[PDB]
Design a protein around this ligand. Sequence first.
Ligand SMILES: Nc1ncnc2c1ncn2[C@@H]1O[C@H](COP(=O)(O)O)[C@@H](O)[C@H]1O
Ligand SMILES: Nc1ncnc2c1ncn2[C@@H]1O[C@H](COP(=O)(O)O)[C@@H](O)[C@H]1O
Ligand SMILES: Nc1ncnc2c1ncn2[C@@H]1O[C@H](COP(=O)(O)O)[C@@H](O)[C@H]1O
Ligand SMILES: Nc1ncnc2c1ncn2[C@@H]1O[C@H](COP(=O)(O)O)[C@@H](O)[C@H]1O
Lengths: 315, 305
Amino acid sequence: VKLFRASEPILSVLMWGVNHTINELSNVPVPVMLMPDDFKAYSKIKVDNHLFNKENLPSRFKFKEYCPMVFRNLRERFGIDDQDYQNSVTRSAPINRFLTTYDRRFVIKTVSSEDVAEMHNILKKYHQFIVECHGNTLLPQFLGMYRLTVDGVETYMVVTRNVLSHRLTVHRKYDLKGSTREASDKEKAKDLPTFKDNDFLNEGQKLHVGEESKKNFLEKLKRDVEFLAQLKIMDYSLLVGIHDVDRAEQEEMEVEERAEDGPGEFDPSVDVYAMKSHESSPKKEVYFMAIIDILTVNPEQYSKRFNEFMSNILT
Amino acid sequence: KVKLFRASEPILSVLMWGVNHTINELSNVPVPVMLMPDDFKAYSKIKVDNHLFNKENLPSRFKFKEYCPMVFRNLRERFGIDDQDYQNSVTRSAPINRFLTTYDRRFVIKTVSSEDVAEMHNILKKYHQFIVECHGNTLLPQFLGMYRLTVDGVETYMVVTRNVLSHRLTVHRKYDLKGVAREASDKEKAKDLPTFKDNDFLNEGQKHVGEESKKNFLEKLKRDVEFLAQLKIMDYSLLVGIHDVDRAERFFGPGEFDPSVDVYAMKSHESSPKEVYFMAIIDILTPNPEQYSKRFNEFMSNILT
Ligand SMILES: Nc1ncnc2c1ncn2[C@@H]1O[C@H](COP(=O)(O)O)[C@@H](O)[C@H]1O
Ligand SMILES: Nc1ncnc2c1ncn2[C@@H]1O[C@H](COP(=O)(O)O)[C@@H](O)[C@H]1O
Ligand SMILES: Nc1ncnc2c1ncn2[C@@H]1O[C@H](COP(=O)(O)O)[C@@H](O)[C@H]1O
Ligand SMILES: Nc1ncnc2c1ncn2[C@@H]1O[C@H](COP(=O)(O)O)[C@@H](O)[C@H]1O
């Protein structure tokens, strides 16, 4: 019995819309293959509830889903069941627009009309490219694109798999691109600041993943970034998050002590970007690495610049 | 499990979609402690525009309006109808033959007019109150939902009632009884199941129900009609159905029925020459009326032994 409670009406409408579209989708047979129209497709629903059901939702709102057949399939290819996805978004409000779902599995970006245009151009190729790699990629996994209308205003959203873990704590993160950058004193003030290229090198940080992994990683990064230049795309980043296993085990202990008054483990079928640090690492760690920001010097250039840098991070 | 909304016309497919959509939406709405005045002036409107999506049974573009959903959900409850069953009955399979029934013959779907919907709003508060007071025990039509479909820019209003007739027992003759010169017409007398009238009944000599039933059913009919008269309504009929058992001759034997589903059904008295009767009031959305009640109420008391 879902109320769609949230801090803002926009979030209620998002919960409502993901709920409503996923249910509708489930009365729609699963196609043998996709069709070219499915990439021009969209659903539009428009609600006027007069003196009815207004405890949580506005009386009046609009929900558009772009290419709902393509993104259903995109979800299947990434191993996300539609009911799981729906539940992550509807059981309890997303919290942060840069939203996460209450359970941290899914990330919800507010985007621009441009971004949405860009999604459409690249969509045909992105699908095929997710197909021939079987979902094995460091690229953003796109699960849904939506336009919400509340109080006459329009908001564009894209849903992605969280790069970071849904359970394990991130103690330090970077945004990397590979260009001739630094996190501002304003950032450095945040609890968990987003650091950048020069911060990464300036502190000598390296990630000890182990060779069988460093290779499976750099081969992904290679297809991925060649695909991105081939599509003429630029300015993307490697998000790099670091979880210190031993420091978390202690944070836990201090969390249990307070209330009263396993470690380094993750499901690679959920924490899809996560690598254990090599037996020989100086610290017991977990990393999360994946490419972000591909909607929005040159492309052929960035590709190789970007690629050399990320290769040097690992060992 | 997968509900396609395959139906004869696309308007029926919208109906299925709409009942499905509103009933689900409602399952997320708490059941309130009481209805409020606004519940009688409320509605849901939803407008669907699907481009190159989900167009196998549904139009790409259509509109669905549901009137006073909190009232009708309460009415359903008071009539002992579960929302999920109601939903399944409309939704599992297209309705059949405007005047439809759901594929399981449990619910009728009458197409009605703008002014009918207006008359409904006009009588809803009092009709609700009366259904409350008689504890759902009434011969009146049981209003389950009222809807407005918009398909092709054309608007169609619908009311769902409970079926008077059984949803399983074949009906072998039926009458429509009011109380002037009215009887089955020439071409009407010709169809598979004719709808005879007061004079075809009287001149058919047709009359056999337990004394208890005649007593309790007449206490029912009277209480209802004094209410239909108080509301300055008239022109309503009494739909009667006759089901002969022998003529029908694992399985549900002859003359067997679930009184909780077939709510108007009544078996013959021992003394009878062996039938099942179906009786309830119909057609009450149309505004002498006080005399229409007694004229109607007595022509009826003389068809029961
Ligand atoms: N089927 C499509 N193909 C390409 N671009 C689109 C498509 N649908 C919407 N867009 C673009 O996405 C942005 C927002 O579209 P709209 O949904 O109409 O608000 C605009 O820049 C549109 O041109
Ligand atoms: N897929 C993702 N998973 C987790 N965090 C993300 C993801 N994409 C973006 N972020 C976060 O958003 C910030 C930059 O993205 P944004 O400002 O929305 O362009 C970074 O500091 C990240 O922590
Ligand atoms: N086993 C441990 N490993 C690392 N730091 C600890 C450990 N136990 C306590 N500390 C730290 O010592 C200080 C005192 O912690 P506590 O024992 O909770 O008062 C805090 O800075 C703790 O984080
Ligand atoms: N509530 C009801 N349950 C079952 N049959 C009904 C009901 N109301 C009307 N009918 C029948 O359906 C037809 C009604 O259509 P009409 O006379 O055009 O309004 C007649 O044949 C009636 O006997």
